[PDB]
Amino acid sequence: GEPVYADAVLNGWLTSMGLGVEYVRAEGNTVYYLDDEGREVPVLDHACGFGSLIFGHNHPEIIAHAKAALDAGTVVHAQLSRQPRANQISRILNDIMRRETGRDDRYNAIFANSGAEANEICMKHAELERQERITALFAEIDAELDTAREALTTGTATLDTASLPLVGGGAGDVDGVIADIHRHNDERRAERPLFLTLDGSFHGKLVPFTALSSPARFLPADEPELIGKIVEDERRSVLTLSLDKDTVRVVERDFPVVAAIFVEPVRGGSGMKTVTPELAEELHRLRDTLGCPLVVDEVQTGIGRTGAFFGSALLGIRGDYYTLAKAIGGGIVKNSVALIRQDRFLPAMEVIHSSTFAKDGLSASIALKVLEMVEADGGRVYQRVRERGQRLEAMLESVRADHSDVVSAVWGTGLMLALELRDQSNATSQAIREKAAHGFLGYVLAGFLLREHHIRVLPAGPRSGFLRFSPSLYITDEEIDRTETALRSLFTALRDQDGDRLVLS
Amino acid sequence: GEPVYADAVLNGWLTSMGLGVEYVRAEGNTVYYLDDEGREVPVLDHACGFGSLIFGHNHPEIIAHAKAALDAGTVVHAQLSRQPRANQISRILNDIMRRETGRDDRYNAIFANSGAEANEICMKHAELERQERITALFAEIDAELDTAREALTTGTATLDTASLPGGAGDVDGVIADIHRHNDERRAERPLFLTLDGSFHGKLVGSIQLTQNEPWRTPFTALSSPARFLPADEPELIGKIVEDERRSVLTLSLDKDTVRVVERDFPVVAAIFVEPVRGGSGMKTVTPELAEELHRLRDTLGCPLVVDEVQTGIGRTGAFFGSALLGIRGDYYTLAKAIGGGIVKNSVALIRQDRFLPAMEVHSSTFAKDGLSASIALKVLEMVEADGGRVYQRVRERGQRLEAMLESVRADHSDVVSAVWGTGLMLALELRDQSNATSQAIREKAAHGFLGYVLAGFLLREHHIRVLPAGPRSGFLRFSPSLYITDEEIDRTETALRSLFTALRDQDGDRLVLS
Ligand SMILES: [Cl-]
Ligand SMILES: [Cl-]
Ligand SMILES: [Cl-]
Ligand SMILES: [Cl-]
């Protein structure tokens, strides 16, 4: 019971999973810990900052660039001055998306410190768009009411009394029905925006903390045919008086309820599942139907990792807004960006977002270096990601084939891959069964891989039911062979229900 | 109409304010831009990343440490492994607060990437505490309902007060109505109280990059409800909070009578206070306000969250502004200066006897990174060196800067209303210029841009970088490094006397670019 100042519960839980190690150095695909003699033990890193390290730990070019930037006296803090590097970064991202989608679309960039903050920038801009739509709708309703009033206070038109139940609340005189319409409409306008998201994703603030964020409706990614009815149930109306020749009727007008649709091209939280063509088509339909933006959240993938810069370009997701974070800090610094199609972009938004660290000089310099590296030699790097990915996936598919009793599937694309583990909650071995019941099986399997094979793997998905494989593009054939050996060993032990060997006492 | 990919509105606005410059290099208190010949023009920086650069731009010790850390192959990304530097950083902050407050209290640390994210961690942990309180209250109401039912199906009568839910008066029906009334209260979102806080100011959209409009709250529907308490009028705060009281219902058994009665519900998740309010022009918490917040915290049972992310460690003349001003918080947030002016790091400190350990086990890939952790340990070594000499330096430099600003205020009280702040976190309040005789000045004041126009004059004419704060850019900030020289403070004095003479003379031609 000695004083602790951080991580006592984290460190105790890591120790029980077999993941209580301290890494003291890292280079490429290798992290090192110290044995009891204090020698560096190399460990192969398949987590790689959850796919941030597409160039690996501490890439010599990124390290040399960061030191050159510091040696130049780069202005890190230049808030409310001209920083041309923001526009240079955005120009490159615009050119890359134009090439990958074949669409001549232009995007404004707003920079931030984390994936969640870039996603939050999109929630704010989306809510300013919804408010512009509400303003336009309410101006039109105001004009419709004044035309209807001027006709009902002269010869011009009948107020059709059969229309009055749509307001419901006494009044039968003109000024009274209109007062009740204003009140009904003011209530709808007071309601919080709705965000549409997919089961297995979170987007910054969007998901015991429901009460901290805007309402979200979670849609089933696996059943795009169910999505239509779910969203149809969120329809709401405001009221107006419509003059049709000689007749005023009270009518329903659709209200902008939904501020935005969020989608990740690859859902880490679903075990590295990619958006299907069917789902992409349903989100396109939703976006076209609601008039809200489709926000494509790529902050959790890592630029280039799917085999294209934009996973969305690869999967044909036609977004209005895009977010990036992972890999743009070169595995040393923190940067994120919201890209908002210029024909939707509200100029006000450029001077709304206020963050001290955002758009800093150091991470801007590092981002321009990363974009040079990822674009070098006519896009060879994307070719390498695709070739390394095919090799890694073939190995995982080969392990799945011989171990289908405990591995259900291979998921993902490029160098963003996972194995799905079959449920072990009915396991023979008490120690395995108990860990599976608490949702920790993936963590204990990862512990085995560390202690017996010196391989760093971390789980993904609900109840640690998947193993992530997201190494750098420098992963060697030999490193993939050692991983295969480690997984055959792991899945044999799990097949044989060896709880003594897999779960630490 | 050439294609532009970022900053077209920002850059156009900066140009019109006289602030359209690109700084290409920085060291200490100096940023450099290029003249038309491409030679470096030195500019004195009183903004210093809004007070982040307590050690100035690119401090040689911090730069040398950061390069050594990169050369050593520091593990930046080690998520779900042992990272003892987090515990080492927390231990130092714990020891510093112990020394500055004299209280032997312990705090758990949770790291994030920005001041806003450290503040958000406090909102989350506060809301877990409120839910524990709700659980305990509802357990007690459950037992009170079971006692009341068992007595009303034996020997006791219910009194009239069915009003508070008031139909049939039968046992199962009154209880059903109580469950329903209580389920509604329990569904309500938490309320946050803030003392004109910059955190909730930014969250609701009142505080923006280039303006502060308390009347403009476009994003309230994206966040938990916030009630803004008037920091200037602590005597009004009690009644405002009294009006936020809400009740759940229970059955109270007294001898042979069961009555429906109201019990207090935990409405408020947390109280947020900044020791120095940047957004209100560097105003410090008064003893009277501190006492009112202590009372509120003790009365509500919610944490007092002390947000120091916008101050900068050491800048008030103590490490913790809260220690200096006697604010006894439950949670504390830091960000500015802990990244050494080169990287991004923030920390939430939560009193260990309130701390819910769930809170520390994934929020953010970048959080608790190895590089910013190494740099934070270097900054803490630097700020603590030589028996706290650096806090002594901040206090001495601050006193010199404040005396200069007070002497400018004295001779220019027609256009400068006050000096605010403490240590090297200072501001001048400008009087409103909405009635200015100069049309060019009056128009800029009507758009809330007076402070930015004045800052443009200081850049153009005196090569001094100042940035305004507060509603209608009505304050000028002074937050340089502790290395600011006597001659740099003299040049600033000269620049301000020149500026306020031109404003006195309503010289719109000189102050506002055509
Ligand atoms: Cl280390
Ligand atoms: Cl990165
Ligand atoms: Cl470059
Ligand atoms: Cl900093």
Numbering used by the authors:
A (entry chain A): 6 to 212, 226 to 523
B (entry chain B): 6 to 170, 174 to 369, 371 to 523
From the paper:
Interestingly, in the structure of apo CrmG in I222 space group, the two catalytic pockets of CrmG dimer show completely different conformations. The closed pocket is more ordered than the open pocket. Residue W223 from the closed pocket forms a cation–π interaction with R451 from a symmetry-related molecule, indicating that the closed pocket might be stabilized by crystal packing. In addition, in the catalytic pocket of the closed apo form, residues S206-V212 form a helix, whereas this segment is a loop in both open apo form and cofactor-bound active form. In apo CrmG, the active site is dynamic, which might switch between open and closed forms.
Previously, the biosynthetic pathway of the immunosuppressive agent caerulomycin A (CRM A) from the marine actinomycete Actinoalloteichus cyanogriseus WH1-2216-6 has been identified, and the critical role of the (S)-selective ω-transaminase CrmG in the biosynthesis of CRM A has been reported. CrmG catalyzes amino acceptor caerulomycin M (CRM M) transformation to caerulomycin N (CRM N). Moreover, the activity of CrmG is insensitive to inhibition from ketone α-ketoglutarate or pyruvate.
